[PDB]
């Protein structure tokens, strides 16, 4: 006496009535939970809008900073070329004594100094032959003058020419009567025995020769070192100095002209760079703005981070609220299925 199918059939009807009630209970639970989700859905769109507005401002500033930086690095290039142009102008203002010099007129000042350059070389070359051999004429005028002082003694340099010639004349005739000592001894030795009083004429002309031979010995060498370099003593030695004085002047002019013309050439070559005053005058200012823009960017990226973190923080809170709603669905889905199955099973068995 088991398996009373009549109890089963009515117990199955009982379960059906519970599932119908459970489903009507979950229905309210679903709508109440959907209100919670829908509310968070909206707060998520508010966070999405904050995020996109931060993401876009960051991009705008990154592009602004990209363009402004590239242009700035070019301005720096011109600022440097400018100060180099000013430097050149300054150097030319000192070498060339032109305190109010400008780049516009430096073209004509150049050719004014280029001419000053070649006139210092074409006049300097004209005084080329005289100079080199003026050093020799001066070295020989001294070698000679000192030879004369060695023989004659102290005297003025304008008196050396006349003296020098005389000394050579004496040396000439002193050598002629110095080379008589032997012809005279011949006559004396062949007439020493006895005496006709001629011995007095010869013994005296012989002593005249002995003293002249001593003269040749004392001065013969210096007069030899003096014969080739006599003519120079005619010359005025203060013209050698006057000549080398003017050489030095014409050398200094070329030394100054070569460099002056060179400094002006620099200014001309940099003529265009003088119009970069704008770039240099506002380099530090624009660099300050560039760093305030880079600062501005870093602020936005911080606001973008604070936006991506808040958007994520609430997304998780939305996900949790969605987890419970998904559960209610998984239950309603399966319970409505169980209600359909057991419904049809009652219909098929037939026992009521």
Curated annotation (Swiss-Prot):
Coiled coil segments of this chain: 1-84, 110-146
Query: Where is it located?
Result: Cytoplasm, Nucleoid
Which stretch is the leader sequence? none
Q: What is the UniProt domain comment for this protein?
A: The hinge domain, which separates the large intramolecular coiled coil regions, allows the homodimerization, forming a V-shaped homodimer. The N- and C-terminus together form the head domain.
Q: Explain the purpose of this protein.
A: Plays a central role in chromosome condensation, segregation and cell cycle progression. Functions as a homodimer, which is essential for chromosome partition. Involved in negative DNA supercoiling in vivo, and by this means organizes and compacts chromosomes. May achieve or facilitate chromosome segregation by condensation of DNA from both sides of a centrally located replisome during cell division. Stimulates both DNA relaxation and to a lesser extent decatenation activity of topoisomerase IV.
What the record says about family reads: Belongs to the SMC family. MukB subfamily.
Quote the subunit structure annotation. Answer: Homodimerization via its hinge domain. Binds to DNA via its C-terminal region. Interacts, and probably forms a ternary complex, with MukE and MukF via its C-terminal region. The complex formation is stimulated by calcium or magnesium. Interacts with tubulin-related protein FtsZ. Identified in a complex with SpoT; IscS and ACP. Interacts with the ParC subunit of topoisomerase IV.
Task: Tell me what this protein is called.
Answer: Chromosome partition protein MukB
Starting at the broadest rank, the lineage of the source organism is: Bacteria, Pseudomonadati, Pseudomonadota, Gammaproteobacteria, Enterobacterales
